[PDB]
Design a protein around this ligand. Sequence first.
Ligand SMILES: CC(C)c1ccc2oc3nc(N)c(C(=O)Nc4nnn[nH]4)cc3c(=O)c2c1
Length: 600
Amino acid sequence: AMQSTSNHLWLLSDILGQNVFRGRHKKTGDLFAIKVFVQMREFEVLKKLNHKNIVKLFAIEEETTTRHKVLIMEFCPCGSLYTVLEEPSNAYGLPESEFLIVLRDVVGGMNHLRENGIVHRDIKPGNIMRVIGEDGQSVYKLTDFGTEEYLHPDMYEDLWSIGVTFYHAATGSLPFRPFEGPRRNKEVMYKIITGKPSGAISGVQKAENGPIDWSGDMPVSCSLSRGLQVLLTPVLANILEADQEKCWGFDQFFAETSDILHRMVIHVFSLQQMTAHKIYIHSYNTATIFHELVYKQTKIISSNQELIYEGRRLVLEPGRLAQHFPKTTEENPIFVVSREPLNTIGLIYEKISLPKVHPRYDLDGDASMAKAITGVVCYACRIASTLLLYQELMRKGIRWLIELIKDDYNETVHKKTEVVITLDFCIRNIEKTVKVELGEISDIHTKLLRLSSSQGTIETSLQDIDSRLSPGGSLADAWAHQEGTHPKDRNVEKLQVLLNCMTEIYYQFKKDKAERRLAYNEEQIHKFDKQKLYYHATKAMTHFTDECVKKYEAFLNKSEEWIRKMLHLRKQLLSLTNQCFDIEEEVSKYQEYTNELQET
Ligand SMILES: CC(C)c1ccc2oc3nc(N)c(C(=O)Nc4nnn[nH]4)cc3c(=O)c2c1
């Protein structure tokens, strides 16, 4: 039993959205999204609507048995944005690149709809479908053109649900949540929106009939980079208040969003702070503004920013455009160091624990619980891989920094030889004439011998530093390989195994919730795997805090000491080379003084 048309057919079991059925064409076999329910104009005008971010309405037919108006639309095997947000890997926010894709498609689609003049208003993650492009990345489209959670305070009685959708995608949770959720606390919801704190974007009621925790910045669990949060906070803040006097409008919205989308990414890893950062800078900006953003994200003075890339010093000309910078990834960034002592902070993340498991056999409660806990383990896996990444970037940055310091030492050796050759060829060229009026030479020797003495002290204090830049010389990078975690331990994948187990159990509970009840056998399987879920999560957190976190903190403290040692050595070597330059010119005051007398 199924429904058919002149060109398409569909089964009622393959139901998509509740109606829209997953159908096929009678002559080609290609799958289509079949929609089964003045019109003949407003639909044919929707036929011509062609865009990358718009679900192409293919045709309009009439069903066989009921003669209903059936819409032949494009099929999207992946689902909607809401389906993507239901996965545990996005329970605390989408990945950064995926978020940029969502923003680009949403803006690029709504701009086309405004060029054609179609207001959507009800724009939720359920109205944004996701397909797979020919390149592999996702492509999001609009289709159905409000919802109880995405309504405007005045409509609750256009740029609002867009902001709520962007916050939901960036943080994994809704911006305005009462205690018992937007259900019986619905009035609180209204009181939360009419509280319009202007700039703030978040308000969480963490107690029944309690207060509302307001916030203007994104939560710590947000997986976006700090720079992307800096550029994203005002865009949401200015489109989330009931005042039409203080609303941006689509012109300012599209302008600022287009400003964000046109910025290339520069990966910069603060080594002395052990903190990774992404600088969003246009391709036409100069390196001065780049140092400005690096300062605004790391508090490092622009003139003190010394950059390292691929094992070499990197000098950025203040006028060099950003698009001509070397291409950098998350695993091959541009290390920034400074001569000023910097505090060793490390990674900042939200420390979440395991929510307790309930014994009540509840097909809905076990589903929501499994979703929450699996999202927690996903966050623990993300932070685990991020800590491993910070440790490896730390090892590469240190192993490069020691070689850079040794290069500076080698240049100091060059200048030292330049001073020694002149010192000898000027202290003995005078003794050539002495062995043939006495104060003019005695003073010279009493100064040149001082020069050779202090120069010798520089030699000893230099060979001491070369002894410090040797293996095991109270400055070797050997402890970094023998402290924190490594990809050899395979901790990220060790957590990802239990993550796949808990994800399979979660999906099976998602299938068990659709069924209103289970048989006895399937019930006992549901309970057994419900306990195995708790065992998997407990083992995962045990392996996370008692192996990844401890090693990371040991490596971090050790790094905090080695940073002090390295800064000390850098100041010493700088002082020594400076004591090699000012005496390089002090021997220039004597090489031309008496060695060249005046006589016809
Ligand atoms: C249940 C999930 C796995 C899934 C898989 C494929 C899907 O494939 C779709 N392909 C479309 N073209 C539209 C659509 O155009 N509009 C629409 N339906 N419901 N809400 N919006 C919707 C869907 C789905 O739901 C869907 C879900």
